[PDB]
Amino acid sequence: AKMAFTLADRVTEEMLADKAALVVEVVEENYHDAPIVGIAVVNEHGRFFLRPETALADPQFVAWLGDETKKKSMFDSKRAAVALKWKGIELCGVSFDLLLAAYLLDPAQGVDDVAAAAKMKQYEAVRPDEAVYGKGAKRAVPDEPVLAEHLVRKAAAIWELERPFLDELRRNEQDRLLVELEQPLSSILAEMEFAGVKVDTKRLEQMGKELAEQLGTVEQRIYELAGQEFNINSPKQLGVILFEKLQLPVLKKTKTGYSTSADVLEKLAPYHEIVENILHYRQLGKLQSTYIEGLLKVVRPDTKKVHTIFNQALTQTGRLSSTEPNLQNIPIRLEEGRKIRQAFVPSESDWLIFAADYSQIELRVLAHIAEDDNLMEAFRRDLDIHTKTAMDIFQVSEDEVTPNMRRQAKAVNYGIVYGISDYGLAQNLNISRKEAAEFIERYFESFPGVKRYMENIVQEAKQKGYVTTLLHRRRYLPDITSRNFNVRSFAERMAMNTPIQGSAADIIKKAMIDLNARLKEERLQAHLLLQVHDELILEAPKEEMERLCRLVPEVMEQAVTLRVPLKVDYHYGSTWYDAK
DNA sequence: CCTGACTCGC
DNA sequence: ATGCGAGTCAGGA
Ligand SMILES: OC[C@H]1O[C@@](CO)(O[C@H]2O[C@H](CO)[C@@H](O)[C@H](O)[C@H]2O)[C@@H](O)[C@@H]1O
Numbered sequence: 301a302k303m304a305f306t307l308a309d310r311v312t313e314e315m316l317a318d319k320a321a322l323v324v325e326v327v328e329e330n331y332h333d334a335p336i337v338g339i340a341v342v343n344e345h346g347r348f349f350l351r352p353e354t355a356l357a358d359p360q361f362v363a364w365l366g367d368e369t370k371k372k373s374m375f376d377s378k379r380a381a382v383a384l385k386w387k388g389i390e391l392c393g394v395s396f397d398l399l400l401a402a403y404l405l406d407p408a409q410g411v412d413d414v415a416a417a418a419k420m421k422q423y424e425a426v427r428p429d430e431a432v433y434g435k436g437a438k439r440a441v442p443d444e445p446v447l448a449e450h451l452v453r454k455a456a457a458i459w460e461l462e463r464p465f466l467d468e469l470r471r472n473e474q475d476r477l478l479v480e481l482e483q484p485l486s487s488i489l490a491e492m493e494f495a496g497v498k499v500d501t502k503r504l505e506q507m508g509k510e511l512a513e514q515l516g517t518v519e520q521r522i523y524e525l526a527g528q529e530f531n532i533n534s535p536k537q538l539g540v541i542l543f544e545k546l547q548l549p550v551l552k553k554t555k556t557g558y559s560t561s562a563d564v565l566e567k568l569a570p571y572h573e574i575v576e577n578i579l580h581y582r583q584l585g586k587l588q589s590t591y592i593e594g595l596l597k598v599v600r601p602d603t604k605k606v607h608t609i610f611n612q613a614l615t616q617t618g619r620l621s622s623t624e625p626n627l628q629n630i631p632i633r634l635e636e637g638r639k640i641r642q643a644f645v646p647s648e649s650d651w652l653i654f655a656a657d658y659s660q661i662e663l664r665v666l667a668h669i670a671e672d673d674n675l676m677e678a679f680r681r682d683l684d685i686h687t688k689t690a691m692d693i694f695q696v697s698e699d700e701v702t703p704n705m706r707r708q709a710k711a712v713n714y715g716i717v718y719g720i721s722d723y724g725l726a727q728n729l730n731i732s733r734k735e736a737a738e739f740i741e742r743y744f745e746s747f748p749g750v751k752r753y754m755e756n757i758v759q760e761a762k763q764k765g766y767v768t769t770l771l772h773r774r775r776y777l778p779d780i781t782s783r784n785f786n787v788r789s790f791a792e793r794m795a796m797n798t799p800i801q802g803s804a805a806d807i808i809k810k811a812m813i814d815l816n817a818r819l820k821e822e823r824l825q826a827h828l829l830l831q832v833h834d835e836l837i838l839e840a841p842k843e844e845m846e847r848l849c850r851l852v853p854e855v856m857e858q859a860v861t862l863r864v865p866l867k868v869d870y871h872y873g874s875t876w877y878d879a880k
Numbered sequence: 881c882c883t884g885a886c887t888c889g890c
Numbered sequence: 891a892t893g894c895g896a897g898t899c900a901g902g903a
Binding site: 533536537586590593616622798 | 891892894895896897898899901
């Protein structure tokens with residue numbers, strides 16, 4: 301059953317065909333400055349395994365890797381491209397990435413290795429990486445014989461599966477989504493990750509000491525108010541102290557019993573002082589663990605930079621996810637945590653951080669897709685959408701809109717996008733299930749276009765079996781036909797939300813691509829550092845700020861043309877915190 | 881090691 | 891049962 305291949309000692313001419321399936325293996329999950337343990341090439345002439353030390357030292361191979369005219373088919377080309385960047389080697393000409401192709405065909409499959417992608421086409425002559433390398437404490441690179449056969453089988457699979465994957469992508473009208481959006485974006489993300497973001501570690505350690513001090517005070521205050529010490533981080537221990545020793549009221553429970561969620565403690569706060577302290581302790585506790593100690597652990601000692609990894613094939617909606625560290629969830633809501641951003645600084649002297657973000661892109665996308673006259677007119681007048689919704693569902697003038705009315709219209713606007721229920725609008729606004737239902741009724745009366753879209757998209761999900769975004773990304777919703785109300789309802793909410801969140805993702809991804817091209821033709825030194833769903837963060841010399849103030853917003857606003865305008869706000873400063 | 885609770889972001 | 895994510899810690903394996 302073994303697969304025939306040449307275990308080459310030297311690089312030859314036939315290994316450099318202008319078309320080939322290429323495997324540049326990096327076994328370490330975090331591929332930054334990680335080892336390349338082997339190389340496999342499959343082309344018209346045969347199958348080959350090359351030892352990295354040999355291949356990467358050969359000027360002929362290296363040139364082939366960087367020759368844009370020599371086309372390569374790979375799996376997760378970003379991983380190889382970045383690992384190669386760390387060795388000062390450029391990877392060009394990747395015309396097909398099986399991981400991205402698999403992801404577009406069905407995000408739900410969770411394809412993370414060649415074997416899983418191959419299985420989609422009944423191809424099983426390749427083993428899953430986990431079966432070869434193992435996982436966790438047991439993970440390790442196998443002997444050359446086992447390793448070489450595994451890499452060649454993966455390259456062989458890629459070589460065989462390219463045509464079948466492209467054909468289905470074409471049938472789905474997703475060929476351009478792969479070739480003109482996701483693949484080019486892959487190279488941009490690779491540059492972003494490689495460049496990294498500089499961290500002011502001394503600033504972070506300084507914040508750590510101040511937090512450690514505060515945590516100490518609130519912690520002692522808590523043990524005092526409870527007249528006993530205990531593990532505040534233990535949901536089990538906290539429960540006995542609150543609901544037993546202190547006799548606090550039990551209003552909500554979890555899957556295992558006593559509920560000490562923030563939603564519960566907020567309502568218990570009036571009963572005992574210890575509750576507000578527990579909450580605060582938890583806030584500071586998150587800052588310390590994840591954003592102080594957690595960040596410090598991944599900052600490179602030598603460059604003082606953090607190199608995140610953007611997973612481009614994980615989310616079910618087309619969004620990116622960020623890991624080790626997650627730079628898409630750095631505090632900003634509360635001031636204490638927002639200060640964390642003062643630690644993210646430009647990588648060069650006299651450079652500044654520039655941040656641009658779309659304003660209400662999801663509601664604007666909803667207005668476009670549903671073609672609701674009232675909603676489109678609101679954005680055409682650049683009105684405060686929450687005040688406008690309040691005026692409509694409460695039928696009052698702009699002057700009569702009280703702060704509480706806007707707060708509730710706000711929760712309704714965002715509930716609508718999430719496919720909220722009269723029950724969940726009730727749990728969020730803490731009101732009557734029938735009153736929440738009437739808010740929704742009112743909303744759909746003022747925005748019948750949105751009502752029609754919600755109804756039609758669900759029927760479409762049931763008729764076709766999936767829903768799609770502006771750029772043809774799709775999500776299958778098999779549970780939409782379930783006879784179980786909860787399972788079915790969840791699928792209906794996904795049907796309503798995916799085209800919105802997904803189209804917003806498509807737009808910013810296209811903006812990133814257009815922006816990179818504009819920065820290059822203008823020969824600006826500014827470059828992308830991060831993407832946070834609806835915002836782009838860049839760093840550039842202070843001298844380029846005036847030009848970026850006009851360029852970035854324009855590129856983002858013109859990424860796609862909708863029935864309503866796209867609005868972008870931007871700010872810049874000496875740190876990410878100041879880019880406000 | 882793996883699932884759940886919790887808090888962080890958009 | 892309002893959409894989509896990641897990291898840390900407690901729990902028990
Ligand atoms: O390289 C990113 C790419 O790899 C996958 C597996 O094919 O995820 C691996 O790497 C991530 C970044 O280190 C980890 O979070 C993940 O656990 C690991 O399996 C893909 O999901 C991803 O697109």
